[PDB]
Amino acid sequence: VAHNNVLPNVHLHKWWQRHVRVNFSKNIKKKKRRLLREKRRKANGGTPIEKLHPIVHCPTQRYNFRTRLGKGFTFEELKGAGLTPRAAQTIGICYDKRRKNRSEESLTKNVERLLKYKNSLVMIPLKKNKAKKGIGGIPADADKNTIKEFRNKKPLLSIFKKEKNTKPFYETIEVSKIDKEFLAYKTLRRAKLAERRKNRRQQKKDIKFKS
Amino acid sequence: AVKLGAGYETSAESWGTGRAVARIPRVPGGGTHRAGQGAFGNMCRGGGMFNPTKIWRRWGRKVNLKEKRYAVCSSIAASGVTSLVLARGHRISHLKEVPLVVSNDIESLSKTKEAVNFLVSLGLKDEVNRLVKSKKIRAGKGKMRNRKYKIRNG
Amino acid sequence: KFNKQKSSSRRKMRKAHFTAPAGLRRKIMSSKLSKELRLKYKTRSLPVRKDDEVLICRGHNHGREGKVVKINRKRYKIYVERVTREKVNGESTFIGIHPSNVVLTKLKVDKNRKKILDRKA
Amino acid sequence: ATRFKKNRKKRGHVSAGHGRVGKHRKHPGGRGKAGGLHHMRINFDKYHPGYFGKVGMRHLNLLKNRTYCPTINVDKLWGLLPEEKKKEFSENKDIAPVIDVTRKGYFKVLGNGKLKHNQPIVVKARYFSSVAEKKIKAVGGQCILVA
RNA sequence: GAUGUUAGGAGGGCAAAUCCGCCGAAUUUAAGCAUAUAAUUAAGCGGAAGAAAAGAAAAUAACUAUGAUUCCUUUAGUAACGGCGAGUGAACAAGGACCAGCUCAAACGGUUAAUCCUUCGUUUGGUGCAAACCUUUCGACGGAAUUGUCGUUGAAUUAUUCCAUGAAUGCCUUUAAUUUGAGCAAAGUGAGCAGGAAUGCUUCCCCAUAGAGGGUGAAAGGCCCAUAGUUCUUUUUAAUUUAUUCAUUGGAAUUUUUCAUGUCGAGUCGUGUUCUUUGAGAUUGGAGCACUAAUACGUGUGAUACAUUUCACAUAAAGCUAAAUAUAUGUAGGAGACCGAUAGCAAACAAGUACCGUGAGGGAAAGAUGAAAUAGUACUCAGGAAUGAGCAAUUAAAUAGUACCUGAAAUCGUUAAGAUGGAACGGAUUAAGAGAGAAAACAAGUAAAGAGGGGAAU
RNA sequence: ACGGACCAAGGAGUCUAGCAAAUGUGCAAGUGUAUAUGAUUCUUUAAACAUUUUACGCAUAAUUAAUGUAAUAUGUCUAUUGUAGAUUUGUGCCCCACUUUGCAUACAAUACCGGUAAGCAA
RNA sequence: AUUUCACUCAUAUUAAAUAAAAUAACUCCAAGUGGGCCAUUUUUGGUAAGCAGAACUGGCGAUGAGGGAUGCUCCUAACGC
RNA sequence: UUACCGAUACCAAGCCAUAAAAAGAAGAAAAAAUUUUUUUUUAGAAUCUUUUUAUGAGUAGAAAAUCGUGGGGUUUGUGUUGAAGCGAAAUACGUGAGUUUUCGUGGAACAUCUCCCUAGUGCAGAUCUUGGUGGAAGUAGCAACUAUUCAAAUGAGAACUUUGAAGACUGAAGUGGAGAAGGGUUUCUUGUCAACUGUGAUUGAACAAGAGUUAGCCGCUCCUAAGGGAUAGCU
RNA sequence: AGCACAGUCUUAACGAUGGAUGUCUUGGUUCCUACAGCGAUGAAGGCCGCAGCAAAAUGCGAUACGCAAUGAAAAUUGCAGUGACUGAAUCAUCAGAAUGCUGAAUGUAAACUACACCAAUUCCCUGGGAAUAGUGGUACUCCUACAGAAA
């Protein structure tokens, strides 16, 4: 090395020409999967190819405020919507047995979403114009004239898409309604100082509760 | 790019001290003209180029989207001044206004005879003449690489 | 052009033209027909055959006529009755005319042609 | 870009710009950072002083999401809200802006800068600096702790 | 148990680019070198598919929490490892592609193995000319299996809808898509010049939803194949002709009253030690040996060993699984700011051929007449013949005659000119000769005659 | 002292990764739209076009081994102080000396932030 | 000691002379170099050396031109046609 | 003591370039004919224009400005009335890489300097690689195996094909018959001489067309040895 | 009809040798796309053959440079001969038929065209005539049923 330069650390000391790859076929495969999903959606028969997903908070403390699509609703969410999972997988509803609803807000943010999805169901007959009431909480089925008049409108995909969340960053309050005496920094320091003994207290509380 | 094992696919024999020959590698064996000839190398016959072309060259470039829209706007503006388009190579001495606009019925009818007729009636007969007789076989090695003709833009 | 299934590559179709089998060479043998034949048969170009009669309108013999006598698709050439050329040794041979340089004026019928004309009709 | 290269302008100079006596040998001083502490020691001491050795404990696995904490100073607090909102806030003394910096993506508020004198501001921040608190309270605002 | 020239079946080998196991270096770097690095690579052994492998938490987090696997952007050259030297180096969260989840182990049917397989004959109807193929179930026999197959994922008890049918009756129409093979597909072979020969140059017409290419005696949108565009045919896949009854027969799924809180993978986990591997560090995984568990209130993680004890998550030691992903292989297509025969694959060709080595292996050189040889040199003379010459001969051309497009330089021949006493060439300056030269190197205009070319004027 | 008998053809600082400097360009406390997504774009098209109202990279804050802490300070929309200093204003639209402003920058002075000392320390 | 106000020390040849003194000062990036040798004067070791080792200055290297017949270093003098 | 000769140094002048400087964003001059014609010019490109002064070595090294090549967009051209290339040349241009023309050959493509993009882009050397060719040089040399001669035939052609005569050799451990490995048609007949047969050659183991190898008794095949492979296992 | 000394060197014109240059390109290279195995029903690979005149390459397998069938559709030609005047000449497709010896090679061997054992086998007409030393089967391991012997 020489002159004033950053000391090299280039991890290139093995046979790397074998590992080098270049993505010449990026837009080509983007097109191929575009036509793949278009063919799937055209062939399935008008049913949307997307599946409904829960709107759920992101983990950790970095992404506490953000929310995103999750892997399937919970059993209690489906029960509150009135659907057994084992029959709700049929209507494009994702379900997982691993998530647990840890808050009433999480429960109630997915229940009405499931109800909104259920409000748009249009069942189809199976036995050559022999429409039936349905099973397992799936909504009712429609007849010849009904299917002939609904099968040709604009499909709704916004509900399938991630729920846009509008949070009012710009908001304000009355000047006289402020708690002028609060000490946020002192509160933070006191909480950090007192963290150990509260853990002690919770430990002893639960030891008592074990009895 | 060139084939990866181009030129270097043989045996590396460089017995070249005391043999009164250059220390360049030689292919081994006998019974052929190839035996004893200069093997792979920068300067040898059939020895591979000194820096073989690789597919991971920086073929494309990343252009800022803002750069691109600035350039598009600038070219649109340049298309609206008579001197610039005249100097670029278009023969527009007969047309009236340089930001030329036609009614929406231009899209309606789909015969190229009437399209070129509309062009000449608007006053680009000499321009379409330039375009039609600019067609000719291009010079150089490219015309056997599926790149025969060379056409003036209109 | 717009059909990406088939190629427009110079070598790719030069190989096809020069190594085409006899069946495709027969279709390549097609030549324009005269105005009267065009009106009569509603077509524009037909392949030639041995007992056919043709007019050549290109080359050193661009005015002669005559029925063809023999064709061969290996050399992409046809031969008419009275275009004989003298050779060095001292015998008469036939000059080869490319079918693209000739136009037909008459056609014949047979147990095959009686159906080729019905096909073209 | 080859025609702009320096080697092209010295095509017939024999030495190719690499000296006649010194020549251009392959790795005449070692490969990479070979000569640290031995013969490139002068370069290391002159341009990368604290390179050798090690200091501090070991954080066995970091999990940077735990300590992620974007910061913002007090003088930028009036910058988040738009100009029209700021104008309609500064004129009326009966109304004060409430800013949730965690919405904008900031977690701690430091006190570098100067706040506009006699405009109360309520700030909802995950963490607060002592002097930031002091500036806000002096200007007449109040700090809100959120999580 | 052994045995079958018993009946019916499989495995072997080839092929590897991607993929899955095992085994496993050194060159190199550290400017030496031993740990380290190269590298969990090269070589070697074995094993599959169109993808493989991984895959349904004994997971992550510590948050307002997430929810199989895989891959992409990022985390991040970061945490960390390392003669802490050279160097090496993840994981979580986040944004996306894709997204399917499931079954074996115990309970019960014991007022009935309720299961599984083999063989032999019959029929329930069908698309194919045919061959064959899709469906069909009355069985009977022989077995396997209680050393455990199937039914059940709780069971009985109430409250709703499905799933099959046998038979008869009526019924195989019509739009879009997708896809293979087929056809049809505009306009000049108009003057004239020079041409061996236009596709060239002027000039007069056009067709274009076709001005992509290729061929044709030179550069063709209008000569040919075709290309645009359309018309049938082919596989399935969305919409779409037709249900009516008769019948009991069985089963399933959704929701009320009780039990029973059940089961939950053992030489396995784990620990000690050794080796290896890893970023994993009082050990990340694996393996060898020794010891060897608990039973869900458990044990397993929560990245520093330990004791006591909380919390969170998951429920190991059994198994299956399509997608997104990779493809220096083969095959078939399409392209390129790539190479243009010492280049490009070694091979544009009779190329892994000729040839070399006992062998493992090594491995070339070599394209071009002409538009047309359906124009490849006829005839004569001289020669034994090769050949040469012509008053002869094909071609536009033979100094294009098959070592044939062009035909450089090295080197050599002829002719001409010049120089020449142990170098030759040369620098600078002329002089003498020999070549070629008029674009400044004199003469614009002027009047006449001779041939033309234009512009304005009716 | 070494290579060169002659001629033809080929013949050697390049490509990628990463960093810095220099210069140009765009935007600017922001900047880059990453993977991906849609579109009657889809010989030419593997490129152009666009991103239903916080992904990430770098910068916007540093310092400490680290719990962590984190830049005048509310007397005020004057925004630290000097000595030089570019520009501006006048008085004696172009020469001169005085005041008027004080860019950049240099040399310093100050405060304030993180760490370490020293004093006190509920 | 610092700061602010006064007065004022040639500033119209310049707080001594001279000066193709701003061709200055500073910053960034980077090449080559890191075997030297010779001459005058001085000098160490050596009998001495065209020997070995040092100081100043100038040259050779890196540079030709006229001269010393001849000569990398001597004298004159350095170089566009 | 004078005079003279004598540098690429010195002095005067011209020109090139480098550096610096002064300055700059539209109107008629002359000549020749004879008031009227003709002749030339009549300018304004900021990395530009005019003018001025000083200066000019250079290895390693660094920069700028230029000159070329393959290919790509843009522009606009040359080609069968002959393009590229090639040989010779030019009252040609530049300072120079080079550029441009002439003649001949050539017989089908070529350039773009308008501007820019791109690179496998510039050779005198590397005991460089491949191919071709020289002086050496009609030279070294065609030297073991004692030795040939006369006449004839064939043939275009005979020291080295055949025949006859002679003189000789191998000479009892043979250039003699059969021998095996190895070779593979070299064997035979006929024909033939482009190359080979290091001289000639009509010869031939060369070239070309045909043909030729007959087993119950000769061998293999059978047996077993040194030993090899495999089975049972065992790693 | 005669004249040049010779040799060596230089220049020019025309040639010889040589195969550069330029222009060509049914080739290569790179990328993209799509499909993906073959084999005891005998694979890949290796031999041996096959045309009228036939060496190699290509193609084919005793039906041997090709048979049948389907689509196009009349030539193969070097001579010969062959063909319609469309299953006929030639292409293309290729599903039927056939596919020599080997080779995992698998009856025992192998520098053998050697040697076994069991059905002697096969064809003809739909109970009679022939060719024959001439056709199939027989590896090892394993799986599922079967058998007769055993402790």
Side-chain angles (χ1 to χ4, degrees):
Chain A
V1 316
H3 323 105
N4 193 353
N5 294 265
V6 53
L7 294 159
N9 68 316
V10 168
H11 293 52
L12 246 176
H13 290 271
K14 50 189 63 166
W15 185 14
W16 53 270
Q17 297 83 352
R18 179 182 30 164
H19 308 131
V20 167
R21 79 140 68 107
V22 174
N23 63 16
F24 299 105
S25 95
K26 184 173 76 107
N27 291 5
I28 298 85
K29 67 175 36 204
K30 146 168 153 196
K31 260 184 39 57
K32 84 153 302 191
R33 85 179 71 109
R34 243 285 287 281
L35 290 287
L36 172 37
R37 78 173 68 113
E38 298 300 5
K39 152 204 206 86
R40 232 173 78 241
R41 142 166 44 203
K42 217 171 149 195
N44 81 340
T47 293
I49 54 157
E50 311 76 340
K51 299 208 173 333
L52 184 66
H53 289 118
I55 165 62
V56 54
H57 263 277
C58 266
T60 78
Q61 159 275 300
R62 199 158 161 204
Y63 307 122
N64 246 350
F65 31 80
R66 299 222 332 252
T67 46
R68 60 166 171 82
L69 292 189
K71 197 262 168 183
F73 300 85
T74 75
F75 176 84
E76 36 197 348
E77 292 161 332
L78 273 82
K79 177 196 50 53
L83 323 156
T84 89
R86 156 92 180 161
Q89 315 278 32
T90 325
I91 41 167
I93 296 271
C94 274
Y95 155 71
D96 76 316
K97 26 84 172 188
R98 245 167 293 259
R99 233 184 83 226
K100 29 169 152 274
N101 276 101
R102 216 163 313 219
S103 48
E104 288 299 285
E105 303 84 341
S106 96
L107 213 31
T108 49
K109 274 234 286 214
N110 290 345
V111 167
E112 75 296 41
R113 194 191 164 114
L114 280 161
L115 306 160
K116 282 189 30 148
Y117 184 90
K118 198 170 175 278
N119 207 1
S120 308
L121 196 277
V122 191
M123 182 86 187
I124 318 304
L126 174 68
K127 293 322 274 179
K128 272 305 162 68
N129 327 304
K130 285 312 146 192
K132 80 164 171 201
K133 72 150 211 196
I135 321 281
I138 279 152
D141 182 17
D143 73 332
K144 293 196 194 201
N145 155 266
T146 37
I147 187 177
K148 274 281 169 205
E149 69 216 1
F150 322 134
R151 216 161 43 189
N152 61 0
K153 36 211 172 182
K154 182 213 74 172
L156 162 66
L157 294 201
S158 162
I159 178 189
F160 264 120
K161 191 197 309 308
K162 195 265 294 302
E163 184 153 348
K164 300 162 62 174
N165 229 293
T166 283
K167 285 80 58 187
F169 145 59
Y170 27 88
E171 101 166 88
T172 172
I173 82 150
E174 184 39 65
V175 64
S176 39
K177 274 203 280 292
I178 71 169
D179 205 79
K180 188 231 66 57
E181 285 290 359
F182 187 50
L183 272 156
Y185 175 74
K186 157 201 270 314
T187 301
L188 295 163
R189 296 295 290 177
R190 290 311 262 286
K192 190 42 205 209
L193 280 196
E195 190 173 13
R196 296 190 60 179
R197 315 252 176 73
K198 308 228 166 169
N199 287 40
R200 251 167 155 187
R201 292 327 201 91
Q202 200 58 41
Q203 173 116 330
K204 301 179 176 310
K205 288 264 285 187
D206 194 348
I207 295 183
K208 279 237 298 158
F209 186 56
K210 291 280 233 183
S211 99
Chain B
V2 291
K3 174 190 262 300
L4 209 82
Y8 287 85
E9 172 178 358
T10 177
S11 298
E13 195 63 30
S14 155
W15 179 49
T17 326
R19 225 215 292 202
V21 294
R23 301 192 287 216
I24 189 75
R26 323 287 181 139
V27 354
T32 69
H33 317 87
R34 197 76 228 275
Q37 271 174 22
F40 36 71
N42 175 31
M43 69 294 278
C44 318
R45 188 179 168 272
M49 39 189 307
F50 100 105
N51 179 24
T53 44
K54 299 290 169 69
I55 83 192
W56 59 73
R57 203 206 295 264
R58 298 181 37 224
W59 299 116
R61 295 288 186 283
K62 190 264 204 80
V63 202
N64 300 359
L65 166 73
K66 190 165 306 151
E67 291 325 327
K68 289 137 64 159
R69 44 198 40 183
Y70 198 139
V72 163
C73 294
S74 281
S75 34
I76 289 177
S79 54
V81 35
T82 313
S83 305
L84 288 202
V85 44
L86 241 192
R88 184 261 180 211
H90 304 282
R91 323 295 167 77
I92 69 170
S93 292
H94 282 168
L95 60 60
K96 279 76 47 194
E97 207 32 71
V98 76
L100 203 63
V101 280
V102 201
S103 271
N104 283 12
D105 54 339
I106 184 182
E107 293 125 334
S108 314
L109 207 39
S110 47
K111 297 300 286 183
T112 189
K113 167 161 202 134
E114 329 164 336
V116 53
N117 172 38
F118 142 83
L119 220 32
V120 49
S121 85
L122 218 174
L124 295 170
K125 148 82 79 173
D126 80 32
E127 181 84 9
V128 314
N129 269 323
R130 165 184 95 120
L131 298 183
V132 296
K133 33 189 64 42
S134 73
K135 174 93 145 15
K136 49 175 29 180
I137 314 284
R138 99 189 298 134
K141 221 170 287 311
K143 63 179 169 302
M144 65 182 158
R145 284 177 189 173
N146 300 330
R147 209 172 322 123
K148 198 143 77 66
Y149 283 112
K150 181 168 221 213
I151 274 300
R152 229 71 64 74
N153 278 134
Chain C
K1 205 161 90 178
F2 288 114
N3 187 11
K4 303 137 77 66
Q5 164 76 57
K6 74 186 309 303
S7 164
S8 94
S9 198
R10 185 159 153 71
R11 55 179 288 201
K12 278 224 176 86
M13 51 191 339
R14 279 186 44 104
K15 170 194 292 304
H17 172 87
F18 285 127
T19 84
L24 162 53
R25 276 154 187 271
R26 170 208 96 91
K27 170 74 140 152
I28 278 149
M29 275 314 104
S30 266
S31 57
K32 189 165 111 130
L33 28 71
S34 94
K35 198 75 59 52
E36 318 56 34
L37 304 192
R38 180 138 188 231
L39 271 43
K40 234 294 296 299
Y41 295 100
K42 223 57 62 51
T43 169
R44 206 184 147 160
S45 321
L46 300 202
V48 317
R49 269 292 184 216
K50 137 164 158 192
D51 283 308
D52 192 315
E53 168 294 351
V54 60
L55 170 274
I56 156 182
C57 59
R58 200 55 74 179
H60 190 66
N61 356 26
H62 68 308
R64 252 97 72 70
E65 296 198 6
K67 102 178 282 291
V68 291
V69 280
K70 189 250 207 181
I71 74 199
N72 56 344
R73 307 131 291 200
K74 322 161 165 112
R75 330 177 78 134
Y76 287 118
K77 288 302 189 315
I78 71 182
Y79 313 110
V80 327
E81 40 198 328
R82 229 69 51 77
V83 286
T84 35
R85 153 184 189 77
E86 198 46 56
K87 285 205 261 191
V88 277
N89 154 32
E91 70 285 26
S92 62
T93 194
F94 276 129
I95 319 197
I97 318 85
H98 200 257
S100 150
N101 302 334
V102 306
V103 314
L104 313 83
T105 313
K106 262 194 54 50
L107 319 90
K108 55 94 180 184
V109 83
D110 209 50
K111 285 165 184 289
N112 195 329
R113 245 69 203 285
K114 85 205 177 195
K115 327 205 196 180
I116 79 96
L117 52 79
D118 286 332
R119 155 42 171 150
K120 182 44 72 176
Chain D
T2 70
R3 80 250 199 213
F4 300 128
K5 285 175 185 296
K6 160 189 193 238
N7 182 46
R8 281 231 81 88
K9 87 203 314 299
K10 301 200 225 178
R11 248 284 173 259
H13 291 64
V14 153
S15 276
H18 275 102
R20 229 179 238 277
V21 27
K23 308 159 142 111
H24 185 198
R25 293 291 210 261
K26 40 210 316 177
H27 313 102
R31 266 143 179 263
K33 305 182 278 175
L37 271 173
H38 278 322
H39 60 281
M40 317 262 197
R41 165 187 285 227
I42 277 192
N43 176 277
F44 276 62
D45 287 15
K46 201 183 178 165
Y47 304 133
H48 320 84
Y51 179 67
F52 291 108
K54 74 166 171 275
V55 174
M57 291 149 258
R58 288 134 70 224
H59 204 312
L60 269 280
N61 61 349
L62 200 42
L63 290 174
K64 254 145 172 190
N65 277 33
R66 276 181 198 182
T67 36
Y68 182 71
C69 178
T71 85
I72 176 163
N73 295 285
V74 286
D75 45 359
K76 314 259 278 201
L77 291 163
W78 284 106
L80 300 324
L81 34 78
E83 182 46 287
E84 41 287 21
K85 212 175 149 223
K86 167 155 79 153
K87 188 31 36 193
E88 74 95 9
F89 267 112
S90 165
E91 301 313 345
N92 180 353
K93 249 53 67 191
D94 283 8
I95 168 73
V98 172
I99 302 164
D100 177 330
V101 296
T102 70
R103 270 291 322 190
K104 302 312 289 191
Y106 308 83
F107 284 16
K108 184 167 186 177
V109 169
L110 304 308
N112 172 46
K114 144 93 171 183
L115 276 187
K116 170 60 173 325
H117 184 37
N118 303 323
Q119 283 59 24
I121 333 168
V122 195
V123 192
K124 320 221 244 163
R126 199 159 298 189
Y127 304 76
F128 270 103
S129 169
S130 169
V131 67
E133 211 186 50
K134 168 176 313 148
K135 300 227 190 159
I136 285 178
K137 165 182 307 305
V139 90
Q142 169 216 343
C143 301
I144 283 302
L145 286 177
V146 282

